[PDB]
Coordinates of C-alpha atoms in Angstrom, one line a residue:
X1 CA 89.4 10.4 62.6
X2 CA 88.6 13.6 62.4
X3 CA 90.8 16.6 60.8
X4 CA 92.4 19.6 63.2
X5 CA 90.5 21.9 61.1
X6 CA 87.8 20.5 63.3
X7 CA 89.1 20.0 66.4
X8 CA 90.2 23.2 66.9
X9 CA 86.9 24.7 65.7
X10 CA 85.2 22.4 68.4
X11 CA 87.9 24.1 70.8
X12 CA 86.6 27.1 69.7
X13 CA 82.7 26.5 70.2
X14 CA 83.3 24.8 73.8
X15 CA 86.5 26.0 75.3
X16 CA 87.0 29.9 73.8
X17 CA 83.3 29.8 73.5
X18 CA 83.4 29.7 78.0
X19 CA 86.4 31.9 77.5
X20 CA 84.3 34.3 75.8
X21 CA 81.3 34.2 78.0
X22 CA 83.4 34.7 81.5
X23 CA 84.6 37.8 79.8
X24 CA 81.3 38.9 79.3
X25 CA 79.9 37.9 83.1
X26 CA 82.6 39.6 84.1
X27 CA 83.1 43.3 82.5
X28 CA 78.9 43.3 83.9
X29 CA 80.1 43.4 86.7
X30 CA 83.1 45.4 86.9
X31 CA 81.6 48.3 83.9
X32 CA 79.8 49.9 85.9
X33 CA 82.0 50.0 88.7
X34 CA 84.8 51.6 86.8
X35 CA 82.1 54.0 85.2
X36 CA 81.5 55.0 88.8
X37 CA 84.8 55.8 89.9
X38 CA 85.6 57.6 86.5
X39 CA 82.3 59.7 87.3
X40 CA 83.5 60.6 90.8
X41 CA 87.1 61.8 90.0
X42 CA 86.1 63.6 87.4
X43 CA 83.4 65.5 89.4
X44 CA 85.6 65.8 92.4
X45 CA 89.1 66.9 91.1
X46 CA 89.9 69.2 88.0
X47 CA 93.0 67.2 87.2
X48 CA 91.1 64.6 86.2
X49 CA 87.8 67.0 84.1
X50 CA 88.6 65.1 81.2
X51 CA 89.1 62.0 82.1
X52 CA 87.6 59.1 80.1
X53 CA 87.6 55.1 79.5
X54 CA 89.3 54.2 76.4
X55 CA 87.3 50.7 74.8
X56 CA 90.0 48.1 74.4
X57 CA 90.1 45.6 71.8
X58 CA 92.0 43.5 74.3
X59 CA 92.4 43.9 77.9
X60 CA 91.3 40.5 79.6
X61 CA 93.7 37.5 81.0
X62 CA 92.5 34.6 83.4
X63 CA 95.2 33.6 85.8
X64 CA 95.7 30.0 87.1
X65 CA 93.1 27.9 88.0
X66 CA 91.9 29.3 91.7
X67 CA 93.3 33.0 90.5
X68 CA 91.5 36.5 90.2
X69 CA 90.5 37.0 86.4
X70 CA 92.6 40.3 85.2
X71 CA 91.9 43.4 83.7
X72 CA 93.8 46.0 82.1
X73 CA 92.1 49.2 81.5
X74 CA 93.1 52.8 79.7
X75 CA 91.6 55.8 81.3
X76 CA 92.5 58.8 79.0
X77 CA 93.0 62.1 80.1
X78 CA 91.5 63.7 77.2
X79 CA 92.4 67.1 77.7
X80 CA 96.3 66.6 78.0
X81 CA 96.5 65.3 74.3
X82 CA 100.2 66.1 72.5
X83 CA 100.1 67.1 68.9
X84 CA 117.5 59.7 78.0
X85 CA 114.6 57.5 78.3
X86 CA 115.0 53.5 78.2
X87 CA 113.7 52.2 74.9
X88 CA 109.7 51.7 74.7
X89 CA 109.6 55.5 77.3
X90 CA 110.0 59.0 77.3
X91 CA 109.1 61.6 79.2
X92 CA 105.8 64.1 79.0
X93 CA 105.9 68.1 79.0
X94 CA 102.0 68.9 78.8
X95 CA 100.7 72.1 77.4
X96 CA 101.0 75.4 79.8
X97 CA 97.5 76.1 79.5
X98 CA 97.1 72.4 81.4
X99 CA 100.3 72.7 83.9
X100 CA 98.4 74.8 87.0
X101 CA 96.1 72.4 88.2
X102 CA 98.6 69.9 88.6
X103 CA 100.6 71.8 90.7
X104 CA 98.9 70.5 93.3
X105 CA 100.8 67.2 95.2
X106 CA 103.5 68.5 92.7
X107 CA 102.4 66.5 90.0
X108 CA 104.1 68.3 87.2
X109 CA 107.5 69.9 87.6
X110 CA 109.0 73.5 87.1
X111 CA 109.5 72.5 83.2
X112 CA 106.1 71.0 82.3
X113 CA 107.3 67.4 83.1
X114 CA 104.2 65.5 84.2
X115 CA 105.2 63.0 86.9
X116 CA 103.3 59.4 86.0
X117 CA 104.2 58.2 89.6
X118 CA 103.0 60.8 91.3
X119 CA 99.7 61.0 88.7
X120 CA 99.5 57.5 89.6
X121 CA 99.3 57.9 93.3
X122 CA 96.6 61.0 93.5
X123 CA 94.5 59.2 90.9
X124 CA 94.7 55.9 93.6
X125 CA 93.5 58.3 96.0
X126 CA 90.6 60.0 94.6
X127 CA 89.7 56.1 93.3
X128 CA 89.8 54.9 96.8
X129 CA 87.6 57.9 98.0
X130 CA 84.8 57.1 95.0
X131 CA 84.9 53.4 96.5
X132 CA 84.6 55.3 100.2
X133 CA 81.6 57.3 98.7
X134 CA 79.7 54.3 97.2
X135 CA 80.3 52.1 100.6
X136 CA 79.2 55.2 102.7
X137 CA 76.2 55.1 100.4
X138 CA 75.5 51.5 100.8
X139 CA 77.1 50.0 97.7
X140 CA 80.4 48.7 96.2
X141 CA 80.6 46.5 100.3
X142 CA 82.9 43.7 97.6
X143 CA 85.2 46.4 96.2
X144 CA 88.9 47.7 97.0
X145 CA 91.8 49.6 96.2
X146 CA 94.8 47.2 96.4
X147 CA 97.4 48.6 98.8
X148 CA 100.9 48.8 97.7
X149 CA 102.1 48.2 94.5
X150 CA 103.2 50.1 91.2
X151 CA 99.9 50.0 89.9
X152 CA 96.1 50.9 90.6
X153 CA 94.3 47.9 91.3
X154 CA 90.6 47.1 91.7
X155 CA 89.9 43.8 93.4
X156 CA 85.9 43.1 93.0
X157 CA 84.1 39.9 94.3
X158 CA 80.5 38.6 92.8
X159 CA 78.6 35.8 93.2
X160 CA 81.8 33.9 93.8
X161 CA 84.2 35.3 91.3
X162 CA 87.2 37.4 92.1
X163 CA 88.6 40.4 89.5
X164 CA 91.4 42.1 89.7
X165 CA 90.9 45.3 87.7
X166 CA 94.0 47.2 86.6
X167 CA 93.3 51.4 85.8
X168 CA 95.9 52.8 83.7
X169 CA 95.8 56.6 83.2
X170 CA 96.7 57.7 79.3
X171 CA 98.0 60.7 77.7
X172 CA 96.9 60.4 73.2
X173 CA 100.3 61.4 71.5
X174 CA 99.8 62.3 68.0
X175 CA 103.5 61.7 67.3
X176 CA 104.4 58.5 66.7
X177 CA 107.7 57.4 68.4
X178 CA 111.1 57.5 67.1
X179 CA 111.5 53.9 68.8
X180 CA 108.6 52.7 66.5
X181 CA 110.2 54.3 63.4
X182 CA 111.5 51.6 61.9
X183 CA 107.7 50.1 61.7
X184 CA 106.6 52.8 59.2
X185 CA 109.9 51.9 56.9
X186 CA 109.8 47.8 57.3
X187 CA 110.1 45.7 54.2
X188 CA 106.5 44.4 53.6
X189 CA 104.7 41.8 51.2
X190 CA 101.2 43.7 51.2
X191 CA 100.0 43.3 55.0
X192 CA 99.4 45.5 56.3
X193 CA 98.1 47.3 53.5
X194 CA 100.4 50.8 53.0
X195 CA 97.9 53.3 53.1
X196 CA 96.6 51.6 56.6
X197 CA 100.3 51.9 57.7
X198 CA 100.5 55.5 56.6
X199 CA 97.3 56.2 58.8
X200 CA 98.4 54.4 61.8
X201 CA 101.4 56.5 61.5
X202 CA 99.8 59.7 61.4
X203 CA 97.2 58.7 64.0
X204 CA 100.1 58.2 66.4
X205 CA 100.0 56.1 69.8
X206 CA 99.1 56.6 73.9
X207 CA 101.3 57.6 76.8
X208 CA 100.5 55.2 79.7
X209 CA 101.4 55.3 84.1
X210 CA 103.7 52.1 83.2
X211 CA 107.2 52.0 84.3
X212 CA 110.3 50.0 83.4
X213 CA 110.9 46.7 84.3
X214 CA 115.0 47.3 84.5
X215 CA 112.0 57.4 86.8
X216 CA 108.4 58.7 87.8
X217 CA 108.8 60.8 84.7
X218 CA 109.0 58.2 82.4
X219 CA 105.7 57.2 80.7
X220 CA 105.1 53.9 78.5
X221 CA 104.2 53.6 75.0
X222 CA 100.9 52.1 74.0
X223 CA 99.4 51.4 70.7
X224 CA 96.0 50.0 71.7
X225 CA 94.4 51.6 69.2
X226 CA 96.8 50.7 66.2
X227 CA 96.7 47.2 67.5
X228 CA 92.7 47.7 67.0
X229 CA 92.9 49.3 63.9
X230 CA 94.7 46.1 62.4
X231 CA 92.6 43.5 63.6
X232 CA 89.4 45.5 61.9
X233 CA 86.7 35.0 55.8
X234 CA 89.5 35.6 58.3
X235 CA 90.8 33.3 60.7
X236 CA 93.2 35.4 62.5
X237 CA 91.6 36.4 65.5
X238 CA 89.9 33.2 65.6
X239 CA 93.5 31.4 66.3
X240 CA 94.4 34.2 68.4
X241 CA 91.9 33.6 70.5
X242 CA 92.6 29.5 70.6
X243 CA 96.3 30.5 71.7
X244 CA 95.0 32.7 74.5
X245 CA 92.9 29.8 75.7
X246 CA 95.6 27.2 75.6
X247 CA 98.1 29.7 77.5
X248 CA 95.3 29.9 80.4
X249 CA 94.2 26.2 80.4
X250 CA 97.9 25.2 80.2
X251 CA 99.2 27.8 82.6
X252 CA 101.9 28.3 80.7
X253 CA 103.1 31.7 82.4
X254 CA 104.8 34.1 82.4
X255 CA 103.6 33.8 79.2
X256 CA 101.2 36.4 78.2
X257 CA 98.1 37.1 75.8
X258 CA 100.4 40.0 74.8
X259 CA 103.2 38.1 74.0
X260 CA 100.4 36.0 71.3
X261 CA 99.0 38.9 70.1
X262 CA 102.8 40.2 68.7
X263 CA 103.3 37.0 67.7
X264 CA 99.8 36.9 65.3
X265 CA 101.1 40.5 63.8
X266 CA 104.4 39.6 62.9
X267 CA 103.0 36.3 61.5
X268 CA 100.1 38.3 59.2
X269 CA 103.6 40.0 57.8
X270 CA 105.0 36.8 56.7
X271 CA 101.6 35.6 55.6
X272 CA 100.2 38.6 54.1
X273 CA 97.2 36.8 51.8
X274 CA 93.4 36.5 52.5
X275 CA 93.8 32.6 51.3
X276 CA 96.3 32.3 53.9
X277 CA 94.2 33.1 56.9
X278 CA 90.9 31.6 55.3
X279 CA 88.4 28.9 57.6
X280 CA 90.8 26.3 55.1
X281 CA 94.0 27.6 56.8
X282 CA 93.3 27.5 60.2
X283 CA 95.3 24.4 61.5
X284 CA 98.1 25.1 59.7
X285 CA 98.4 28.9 60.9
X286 CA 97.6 27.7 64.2
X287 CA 100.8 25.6 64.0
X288 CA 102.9 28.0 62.3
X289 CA 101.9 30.3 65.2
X290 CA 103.1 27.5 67.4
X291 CA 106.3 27.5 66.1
X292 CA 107.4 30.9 65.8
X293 CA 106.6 30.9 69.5
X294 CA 108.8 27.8 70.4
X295 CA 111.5 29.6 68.2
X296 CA 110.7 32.9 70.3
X297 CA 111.1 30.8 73.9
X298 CA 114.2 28.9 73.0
X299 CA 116.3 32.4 71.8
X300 CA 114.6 34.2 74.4
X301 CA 113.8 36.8 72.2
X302 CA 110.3 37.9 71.2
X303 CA 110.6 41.4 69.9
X304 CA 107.6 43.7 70.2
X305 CA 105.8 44.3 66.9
X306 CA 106.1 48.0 66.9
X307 CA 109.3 48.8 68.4
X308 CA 111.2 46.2 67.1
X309 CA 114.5 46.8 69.4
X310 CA 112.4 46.0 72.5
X311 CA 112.5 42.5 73.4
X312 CA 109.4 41.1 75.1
X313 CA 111.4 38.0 76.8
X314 CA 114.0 39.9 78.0
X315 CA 113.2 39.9 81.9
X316 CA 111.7 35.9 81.5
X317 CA 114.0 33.5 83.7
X318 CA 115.4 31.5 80.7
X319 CA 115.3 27.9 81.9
X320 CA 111.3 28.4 82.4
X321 CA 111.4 29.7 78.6
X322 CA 113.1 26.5 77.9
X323 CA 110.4 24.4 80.2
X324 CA 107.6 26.3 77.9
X325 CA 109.2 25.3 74.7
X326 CA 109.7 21.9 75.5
X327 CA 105.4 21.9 76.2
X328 CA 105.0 23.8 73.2
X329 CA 106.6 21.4 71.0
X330 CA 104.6 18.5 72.9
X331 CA 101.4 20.6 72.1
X332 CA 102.5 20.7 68.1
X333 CA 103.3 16.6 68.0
X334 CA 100.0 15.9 68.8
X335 CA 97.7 19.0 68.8
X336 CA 94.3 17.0 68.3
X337 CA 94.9 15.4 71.4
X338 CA 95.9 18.6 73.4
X339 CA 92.8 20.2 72.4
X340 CA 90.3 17.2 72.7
X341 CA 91.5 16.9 76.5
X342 CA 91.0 20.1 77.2
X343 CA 87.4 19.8 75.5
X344 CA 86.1 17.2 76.9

């Protein structure tokens, strides 16, 4: 017998612990590919002068066994910074000063309305052509540009492993959202501290090249850098991290680490204290974590953490949600076991 305080941390130090270190192999590889390309367009086009990578606290997913690893990625366009759409959207007029060069491919419209699809597709363009000018060169022979698609897509090859790269481009919004309002107002029991909530507020959010999943106008709300400026003793990210690795090792898609990560937020609300999330309280927020997400599957509602009115699940086919609770609530009757399968 041993307790699930130490099985999971065994999970930890084997499975996360290879988790961790296939994250690493991989962003060697790909970092320095992505610089490239960033260095090109920015060289070559003066729509994209200011363009930048944006650090991530979390961007990587593994797929199913046999699967590309995936990416997602943040490339800001510095310069464009702001100081009736669907909920989690809205539309972008950029400064005057910044409309002319992206009058070109009609990228912005007689109002200042930047056009993320079109953005989109002359960004894919100049990426392909950086790829062109490294292959031309004699490099890069195991990258490409995905063709098709809503999105910008890198698939790299190395040493065996495939990556599927993901380039978003990003506008910084100093507002923060009306749709996210209600996150500045919520009733709280001290977590998030209020003064970190007051300057997450003010800091504001990003405006990313997503679109809805129920037009080329609209641009996505992001708040990558509030979600990083939370997660900066403590076990959260610790069981975040475990979750993450059972979705992947369980395939339990659609499922996403996205999905977890909301889940962990809302759950640091309800659970506000440092003793609650000490090395003590690790098996038990690991299944309370379990739990709210079996709740989450079986209503088919998982509302996002900022914007509380947008609903995560909504799009999921609801009988697979029901499939994924029915494994979830295997995985809490007899987690030890779960986890020393998977460790072997």
């Amino acid at each position: 017998w041993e307790s699930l305080n130490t099985t999971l941390n065994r999970f930890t130090d084997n499975v996360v612990k290879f988790r961790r270190d296939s994250r690493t192999k991989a962003l060697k590889c790909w970092r320095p590919i992505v610089d490239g390309i960033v260095d090109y367009v920015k060289r070559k086009d003066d729509r994209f002068h200011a363009l930048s990578v944006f650090h991530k606290g979390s961007y990587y997913e593994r797929s199913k066994v046999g699967e590309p690893d995936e990416f997602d990625l943040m490339l800001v366009m510095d310069n464009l910074e702001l100081y009736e759409p669907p909920i989690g959207f809205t539309t972008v007029m950029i400064d005057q000063g910044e409309e002319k060069p992206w009058k070109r491919d009609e990228c912005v419209n007689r109002r200042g309305m930047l056009n993320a699809t079109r953005v989109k597709a002359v960004f894919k363009r100049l990426a392909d052509e950086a790829i062109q000018d490294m292959k031309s060169k004699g490099h890069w022979r195991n990258v490409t540009v995905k063709s098709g698609g809503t999105a910008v897509t890198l698939k790299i090859s190395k040493d065996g492993r495939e990556y599927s790269v993901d380039l978003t481009l990003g506008i910084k919004d100093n507002t923060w959202p009306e749709d996210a309002e209600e996150w500045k107002t919520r009733q709280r029991k001290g977590w998030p501290k209020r003064n970190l909530v007051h300057d997450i507020h003010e800091m504001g959010c990003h405006l990313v090249t997503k679109q809805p999943k129920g037009r080329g106008f609209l641009w996505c709300y992001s708040f990558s850098e509030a979600e990083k400026k939370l997660f900066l003793n403590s076990c959260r990210r610790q069981v975040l991290r475990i979750l993450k690795a059972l979705r992947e090792e369980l395939e339990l898609q659609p499922l996403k680490s996205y999905h977890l990560k909301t889940l962990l937020l809302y759950e640091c609300e309800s659970q506000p204290s440092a003793r609650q999330w000490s090395k003590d309280a690790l098996s038990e927020r690991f299944l309370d974590l379990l739990k709210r997400l079996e709740k989450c599957l079986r209503s088919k509602e998982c509302p996002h953490y900022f914007i509380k009115d947008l609903n995560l699940f909504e799009m999921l086919n609801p009988e697979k949600c029901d499939e994924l609770a029915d494994r979830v609530n295997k995985i809490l009757k007899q987690p030890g076991q779960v986890l020393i399968r998977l460790i072997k």
